[PDB]
Design a protein around this ligand. Structure first.
Ligand code: SIA
Ligand code: SIA
Ligand code: SIA
Lengths: 537, 177, 58, 537, 59
């Protein structure tokens, strides 16, 4: 490649291959990356402030302590290239194709390259009035590339702050510095004081005696690249499970044997539930044979102290309940019922907002997923289940208990197309989580290695130990990331006589919003990832 | 596992965006306007506490649950964790991390015959699955608005074990275990 | 006389960090003499945690 | 490599391999080196002043003549790359791993490379007010590399001034010019004048008639390297002896047969030494059968005129006694007893001090090494050893004699982790030293060759013989040193029932001191290298 | 038989093998009866006789 030869080409195509019941989706993605010089060459450890809106007093009785961002971290000069997000790999029509023709999909293979490295220095001549800026190629300067393939580094590539590569192929991407948490205690007591209505800090500090500091240089080998050089990751193979591309409408009342009914005789008539029937009923209940007290084998969904706030070591955190739609309880569209473990994506120009300088937001409420709908405040429990109706006592409402148990069947959220993460690392604990609250794929072994890049420092002639960015020629780079993500789906064929509602843009949206305007700005649409009804049983 | 885990849900995954401190006494400054995924319909206060996560470390529990089965009462154990983050006064002994106590004698590693010795195993290194039930809360909605006095509950004692939960067992307890 | 043979299989622990670990030892507030025979031969065995060292969960 | 291809990568990992009783430690180190143009292109010979604090008069009666730095040297335009120091090869957790799992360790192999050479010239445009600095790549400029593999050059790579490559992988390193001593006489008489209380200079001058001048260019072949060029040393094989990773607590009173004792009967009682016993005793002593006069085969440690000042040709120099702990004599921690041949490392930001612009210092007092403790002033000798106690005469104290002899067993200091040298050259004399006062490894054949580098002069268009740095374009370079040091240890397994004290940070230190702070500054901890007790006999 | 209380460690690659030998001298008396017996017990120390602690001490 020397200096005047390209080290790679550009492929953003998505390819579909249909054979029998199997579909193969090959996602090519290419992104032009802009990289500045690291703001310091040092690893730093520091903690933060509370963040916006955290209380200074007891005006809200500590209910606003949920606003806590406090944390301690070890700053690292390195930058992270994270492709862990749909949209980085597929455009809307491609994902529409995926969710129309596939009933489920799995991850199979991931390959990555970096190439066409350009490193430039900036010179500024003349005084302020005639200040002129010159951009010169530095042909011998170096780009540093570290891929942690053994997952020895703390995994922070979950896309929860949307640090991923941008979604639209023709725009440049910038990178965020790699940083990870260190050990700190952030205990806040929200039942402090008399009346237990006051919040007080208990322990807020870094745990130095226990702290773990793992710099890139001593943990992984580092490749050094000049302009004629290219880099390849080598193959990565996913070990994961398929995600369902369907939504389930069936509750326990929708499943199994139907209550015996005699048909209506004419157009306005309704069926009539049969009175004297046989069957299995819960408890000692036979007189009122009713669908509600019919015994079942399983139970769909579970209740939960919804929007549980944990307050662990390190501060409060939402303990998520199961995802479900609040549409069956909605009524007034003005009031927003958040309790189905709904999520909200806040995003920007590179992540699919149309307007620069203003962020856009999509509230994902999971409206199709019903039948695991389980709003805690609406449930009840009674002392006995019999032919007799229990008294006022013997009947309880508004309990907020966790009903997850050995008989429970429940769906995860599934793919959230534009902004959602693809994979996640499995926590290394004795009891592995059964399912993921956001990312559709859980990597059984290590996830794809974190790809970290840093522009090597380009020093001036005078190197002083007291100096930081003074003895550092101002330097920046551009290069090209390419990636190949292979997906394996199973074909979707009609299971019904009538017409399906096929995947498309969200309900209240018009196509123009997702199309370039006069100046070239447009948004990407949310696509559900469970887009179509299927039977649970 | 021969290791202890210090990471809670607030210690795991992506770090809240922060600009670095410029000097020795300064702390990092959490960035205000950022993108990301947040729970519920919450975007105005982008905060680490309401950041969405894939899993949850630890679970709450009606700690020192007494069962009273057939055959009499028995402790239904919650998960092991350290109470060190809540401790403060060393005089008061917080037992709630499913701590255990070994009572032993001369042949089992006590020095004095005729008197038994005892070691209270409180699991001090295991933090980040620390989950003291009385300190938790739940709120009706999660949004840009702070819920009122009603709509906010404390001191519930519910079991939060569920399909998203990741939790460690106690591990080897060397002499007596 | 009872005799027994118990075979264990471990996986090696190698440094995952730059800085120094706190290596397994006696419990905090304890002195070594407590775990050593005295004049008449009496001593205690120390508690050892079995999860003795930090590691990353994720 | 041309101009746009990297000639090497970065590996700072340390690798441990355990098989049976053998451990293999592979230390990879990579350092980014900043090199300026030599301050002159000429070899120079000159002598110096006395240095700070040397007396101008007889106020201290010449006791302060120990402050003499006088010397003569032959300045050389070349710069030395010296990796001879722990810390350049291992981070604290790696060395902790080494001293926890190994009872002894040997040096086995050393390999080195230089690569990714970048040479730049600086241009300054405009007058003072609009002075602008331009940094341009000089693609055809040369770096000169000389490795003296035959050890024909004077060996000055002992790390006694801490000239070694820095200890923390992500910071740049600078180099010191190669220089060596020439023949000079620096004789100072401290017993001059009446009363013999006056110091007077006898001979202070360069010995030209005898002097040896060995420039690099006529002694070794020199490699010339452009930006696309790399350099490798080839394999070096150490011939040395293993160093002990244990400290010895046993004196002569701790070794061998124990004095016969009847046991105590209860908890507060002490053993009772038996009175009438048999045995071998020194001299004609039988009535008081005592452990002190028990005969032994050997003797642990030796006494010495501690802090011996030699005053040779070339000036005063400390003649070191054996290393030992003064902890058994300490009492007051305020007074610092220096007499165990303790050492002090003075170091800076690149060598493991946290603060730039201020140097840090660690006093290495060797506190674990007891039982060879031999404080000269505390000893005595008596005319006879018998059943009778000698009179006042016949008994002598405070002698300061050297007791090293054919029965003596004594330990060297061992590895001093952050700042200590690794190897040393053997002096070529008739009687080779038996052991080293500092460096743990003595190279039986030549040590690793000195790696010398110099940026070739880049001349202006007008070359004048009267000119020095005027006809020399201002030029500097950066490049990457990598090295591989292979160590072979023997595994350490428990020799006792009870718990060991395992290697960790020094006593009065907190972990935060050895962890990066808000701005990225931290210190490296001293690690003893003899960290754990073992039996001598 | 003989007596081995040694513990042995073997390191190969990533694998460690720990062989724990234990030997104990056991003192055994004659069984206090030769019969199998079935019986129940009392409550044990500290179980309440009354409602002073409202049954909190039934634990
Ligand atoms: C991508 C996009 O434009 N999002 C719009 C959302 C969505 O329509 C709903 O959040 C879907 O539930 O509506 C908002 O007003 C909102 O409530 O935050 C913001 C924005 O107008
Ligand atoms: C083995 C041993 O000596 N155990 C001591 C314990 C431990 O120090 C703590 O239980 C550790 O948590 O302390 C006691 O006083 C106690 O509280 O029962 C008893 C005893 O002195
Ligand atoms: C690395 C480091 O911080 N060294 C500290 C030393 C050591 O604690 C002792 O020298 C150990 O013997 O103490 C000093 O005050 C000193 O006496 O010179 C300097 C400095 O504070």
């Amino acid at each position: 490649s020397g200096v005047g030869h390209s080290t790679g080409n550009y492929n953003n195509r998505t390819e579909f291959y249909y054979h029998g019941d199997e579909v193969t989706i090959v996602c090519h993605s290419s992104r032009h990356i802009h990289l500045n010089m690291s703001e310091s060459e040092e690893y730093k450890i520091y903690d933060t402030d509370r963040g916006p809106r955290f209380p200074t007093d007891q005006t809200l009785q500590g209910r606003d302590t949920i606003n806590d961002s406090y944390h301690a971290q070890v700053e690292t000069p390195w930058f992270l290239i994270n492709p862990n997000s749909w949209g980085t790999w597929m455009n809307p029509a491609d994902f529409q194709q995926l969710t129309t023709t596939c009933r489920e999909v799995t991850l199979e293979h991931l390959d990555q390259t970096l190439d066409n490295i350009v490193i430039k220095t900036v010179s500024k001549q003349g005084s302020g009035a005639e200040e002129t800026t010159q951009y010169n190629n530095d042909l011998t300067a170096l780009l540093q590339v570290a891929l942690d393939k053994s997952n020895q580094l703390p995994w922070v590539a979950d896309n929860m702050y949307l640090d991923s590569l941008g979604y639209i192929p023709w725009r440049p991407c910038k990178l965020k510095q790699y940083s990870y948490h260190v050990n700190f205690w952030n205990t806040i007591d929200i039942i402090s004081g008399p009346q237990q209505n006051q919040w007080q800090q208990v322990k807020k500090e870094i745990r130095w005696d226990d702290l773990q500091f793992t710099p890139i240089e001593t943990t992984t080998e580092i490749d050094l690249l000049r302009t004629g050089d290219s880099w390849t990751s080598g193959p990565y193979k996913f070990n994961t499970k398929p995600t369902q591309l369907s939504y389930h409408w069936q509750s326990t009342r929708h499943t199994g044997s139907v209550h015996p009914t005699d048909p209506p005789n004419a157009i306005g008539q309704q069926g009539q539930n049969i009175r004297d029937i046989n069957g299995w009923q819960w408890g000692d209940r036979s007189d009122p044979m009713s669908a509600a007290t019919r015994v079942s084998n399983f139970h769909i969904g579970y209740s939960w102290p919804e929007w549980r706030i944990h307050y662990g070591s390190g501060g409060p955190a939402i303990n998520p309940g199961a995802p479900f739609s609040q549409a069956p309880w909605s009524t007034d569209p003005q009031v927003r019922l958040t309790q189905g473990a709904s999520e909200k994506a806040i995003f920007d120009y590179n992540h699919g907002d149309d307007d620069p300088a203003h962020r856009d937001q999509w509230w994902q409420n999971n409206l199709p997923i019903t039948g695991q709908t389980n709003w805690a405040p609406k449930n009840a429990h009674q002392a006995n289940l019999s032919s007799n109706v229990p008294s006022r006592q013997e009947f309880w409402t508004q309990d907020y208990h966790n009903t997850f148990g050995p008989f429970t069947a429940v769906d995860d959220v599934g793919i959230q197309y534009p902004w959602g993460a693809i994979w996640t690392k499995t926590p290394d604990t004795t009891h592995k989580p059964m399912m993921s609250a956001h990312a559709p794929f859980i990597c059984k072994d290590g996830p794809p290695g974190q790809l970290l890049v840093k522009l090597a420092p380009n020093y001036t002639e005078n190197l002083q130990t007291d100096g930081l960015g003074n003895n550092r020629i101002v330097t920046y780079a551009t290069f090209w990331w390419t990636g190949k993500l292979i997906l394996k789906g199973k074909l979707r064929l009609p299971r019904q006589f009538n017409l399906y509602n096929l995947p498309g843009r969200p309900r209240g949206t018009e196509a123009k919003k997702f199309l370039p305007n006069e100046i070239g700005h447009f948004e990407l649409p949310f696509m559900p990832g469970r887009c179509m009804p299927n039977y649970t049983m």
